[PDB]
């Protein structure tokens, strides 16, 4: 019953940031902090109240807390929310990254910050609704309604050093990609609903009703193909990945849009929740293609990330490679691989959040992002080079950080299922270390290659240092003690895996 409020209080908070903007320029940031603190507090309350550690697996469906309201009764469409361990973990991560995004844009005294904050929490409420909703039309509605504030923020509030045409082009490319993939997902959803109506005779858009749908082979393959095309653009999966570095590079220079918008990957949650249980046989047949797409994504993203002269573009390609690892993890049908996938998504979100925040602050210090114009920056700032060294160490899969735990349980489950893809992915981890070292050496080590890197730069303030140290502590605790996270998602992942491997 707290889930409708969990979606709503970001929207009410964004409306309050827009409305209380007339009270002063410095007011809506405080309102946004209060409402994201409240959203994170309710997510943690659901974590402490759900009892996720001692929960068994009763089969799909098994929701810890659900909500029903009729929305379009003509089609049997409901505002239908449901939370379990995986959804709760992603909602907590959403609240954390939303708090970090609000804190990261604290130094803006611009004239129209109210609409910036309104679009930010519209994005946050949309992605929270994607995680919570299981009704197909409502899930699709959140999936495409979180898209408009992303476009507006990238186009209007984006990177000030670039022209308006480049920001407009990047935003339009991202919007066209994501909304066309939403449209083909809607085609798959509609065809699934019509197949269920022809089988039974009742208008159901509900996720639990669509599971017991008899489909011939070939139709289910096409529905799975539409779902995978949507979740492949949104992952990203190559070659459907060109929107990601363009949207990251022309994002706002504070860095809040990267954390709130794209750094929570709804596509892998959609694959775990919708692509695998609704289409078990089609996904089992598609597993070689998806796993080889993951291999190509890992190596392609590494080869991009080594060859980028832009640090933000580099981190975007790190995201491409890590989500290629997650894509390999999804299509194995293993308990250990799925749990490693969950750990890898959480750790990648935290590590890329730290990397994006530190890159934004580096750009604020030095007023450039080209990696050929900077060097020897370890002796020029106080805290930023060491923290970026820690996060670049985290992103290459280092023990003591959750990335190693997630990637290694992914590889253990995969090698239990397929060995060759596992060994090629481990060489992809070698490539990941290569690009992380290249970024570190071309960014902070060496001699000064320009004049802006030859002078002493001001240090980071207390707020940004506190949030970066919070991310560091969270990554260390995830790496050294991931057991509460594994026990939180043990029931839902087990239900999904049992549904996937028991129907084939």
């Amino acid at each position: 019953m707290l889930l409708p409020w969990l979606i709503l209080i970001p929207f009410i908070g964004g409306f309050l940031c827009w409305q209380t903007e007339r009270f002063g320029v410095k007011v809506p940031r405080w309102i946004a902090l209060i409402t994201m603190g409240l959203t994170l507090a309710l997510s943690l309350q659901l974590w402490l109240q759900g009892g996720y550690s001692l929960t068994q697996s009763a089969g799909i469906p098994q929701w810890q807390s659900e909500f029903d309201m009729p929305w379009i009764p003509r089609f049997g469409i409901s505002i239908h929310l449901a939370i379990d361990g995986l959804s709760l973990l992603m909602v907590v991560l959403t609240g954390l990254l939303g708090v970090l995004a609000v804190l990261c844009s604290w130094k803006e005294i611009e004239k129209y910050q109210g609409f910036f904050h309104l679009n930010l929490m519209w994005i946050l409420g949309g992605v929270i609704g994607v995680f919570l909703a299981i009704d197909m039309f409502l899930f699709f509605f959140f999936w495409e309604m979180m898209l408009v504030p992303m476009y507006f923020l990238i186009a209007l509030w984006g990177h000030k050093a670039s022209d308006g045409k480049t920001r407009i082009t990047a935003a339009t490319k991202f919007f066209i990609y994501t909304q066309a993939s939403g449209l083909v997902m809607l085609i798959a959803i509609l065809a699934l609903v019509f197949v269920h109506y022809n089988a039974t005779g009742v208008w159901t858009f509900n996720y639990e009703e669509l599971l017991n749908t008899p489909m011939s082979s070939g139709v289910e393959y096409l529905l799975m193909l539409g779902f995978f095309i949507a979740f492949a653009v949104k992952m990203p999966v190559v070659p459907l990945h060109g929107w990601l570095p363009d949207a990251h590079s022309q994002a706002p220079t504070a860095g809040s849009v990267d954390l709130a918008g794209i750094l929570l990957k709804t596509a892998a949650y959609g694959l775990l929740r919708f692509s695998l249980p609704l289409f078990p046989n089609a996904s089992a047949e598609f597993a070689p293609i998806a796993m080889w797409l993951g291999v190509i994504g890992i190596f392609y993203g590494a080869w991009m990330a080594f060859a980028q002269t832009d640090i933000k573009r580099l981190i975007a390609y790190t995201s491409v490679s890590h989500m290629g690892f997650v894509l390999i993890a999804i299509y194995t049908g293993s308990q250990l691989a799925y749990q490693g996938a969950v750990i890898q998504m959480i750790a990648h979100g935290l590590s890329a959040a730290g990397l994006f925040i530190l890159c934004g602050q580096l750009y604020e210090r030095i007023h450039t992002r080209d990696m050929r114009m900077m060097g020897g920056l370890w002796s020029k700032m106080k805290w930023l080079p060491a923290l970026s060294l820690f996060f670049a160490v985290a992103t290459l899969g280092m023990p003591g950080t959750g990335n190693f735990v997630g990637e290694f349980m992914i590889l253990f489950g995969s090698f239990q299922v397929v060995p060759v893809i596992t060994v090629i992915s481990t060489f992809g981890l070698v490539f990941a270390s290569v690009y992380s070292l290249a970024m570190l050496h071309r960014a902070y080590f060496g001699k000064a290659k320009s004049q802006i890197a030859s002078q002493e730069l001001p240090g980071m303030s207390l707020r940004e240092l506190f949030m970066i140290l919070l991310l560091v502590v969270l990554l260390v605790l995830l790496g050294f003690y991931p057991q509460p996270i594994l026990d939180t998602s043990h029931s839902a992942i087990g239900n999904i895996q049992q549904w996937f491997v028991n129907s084939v």
Partner: protein, 467 residues
Amino acid sequence: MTITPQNLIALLPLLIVGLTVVVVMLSIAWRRNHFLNATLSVIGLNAALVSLWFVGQAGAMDVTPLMRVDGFAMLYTGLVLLASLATCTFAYPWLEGYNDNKDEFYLLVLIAALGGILLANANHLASLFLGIELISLPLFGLVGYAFRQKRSLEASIKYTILSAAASSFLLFGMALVYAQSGDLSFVALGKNLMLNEPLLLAGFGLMIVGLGFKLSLVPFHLWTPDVYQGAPAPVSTFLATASKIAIFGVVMRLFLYAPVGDSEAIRVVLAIIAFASIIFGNLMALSQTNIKRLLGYSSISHLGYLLVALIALQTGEMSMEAVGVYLAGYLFSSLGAFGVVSLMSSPYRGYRGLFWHRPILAAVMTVMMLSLAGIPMTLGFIGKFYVLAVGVQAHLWWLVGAVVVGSAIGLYYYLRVAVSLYLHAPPSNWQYSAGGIVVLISALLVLVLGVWPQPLISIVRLAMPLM
């Protein structure tokens, strides 16, 4: 069969619009007063709109050999009456700057609304032809209202010649159909049939040519950007909304009530026309710098989507409500967009950075640009979802693929206009305020019925004709 008083009770909007046409005529002849005749036209249109309630309380009846009145005719009559009311509301501040006479505009708008109502109530070939011509002729007058301006005269000449040619084509196809069947009623086309005979097929093809001209369908679509740009902005609003709504309503009535809709060849050529219309109308608006030509190609694409929803009418029973919902959303979005254009063009003399001097109009314009793209939280998405569901249900995969591709292209140019509203550029009268209120309620209705579309579904499904 004779005319009963219940028939005139069901004939309330037609009689009211004719009576207010005569009243506006006599008031113009008495004295040239812009405000008085404008108020008379708005009063007559509102009287027809509230007489729709008494028409609904009467019931569905076949009032003439010509007309049939049901929820279908009621819904389309309400749509064209709303379009005419918005056209008058947008036209008055534009007409405040007209140096010539400003009184014939409302007379022509009322006569075109009468033609639209008669098209909505049509159940006969003669009624269909007369309604098409009664839509077209006041549009000839209104498009070339500012004939001193060059472009208005260009659009008037082009529209008049092309629509006379299309009327000749439609009438020849009508004559061939009547030679085949022998009855001009909408239910007796091919009742004597072996449903495929070349004379009836050729006649229906020529009527398809005429109606596809009137619906801006490819390849009879070349007039649409020219006529839309040349005409005055309230005339562009009326031609985008009321003409398309009425002609597509009578097209659906013809293709539902006749047994010729079961023929596979007409469905195949309609699928070809719908595919070509969607792709051509979306591709032609990629590099359009003018808003009127862009909205004309938008009208071509949206009528292609309506064609896709119409093709699957014989298989599924949910196509008609899909067309009703899409036409309501398209009417509201076109009203908002063309109303912002008209308020920016008013008063008549002779959009980059619009938010920095006119923020509410920019908000309405970007909401309607989001709505026309089929983006959620808007009514155009609900219409596109209905069209896609209807196409999926009857297994029209080429058409839904064309819908997805055209929606992506429309996304590109609509969102380009939307961001151009918010870039950096290098009235004071209650009629202009009334136009602003009209476009604001249009945007609010689009947003509310995008979030919560179910009441519109209930109203549309309650508008159920004789199956």
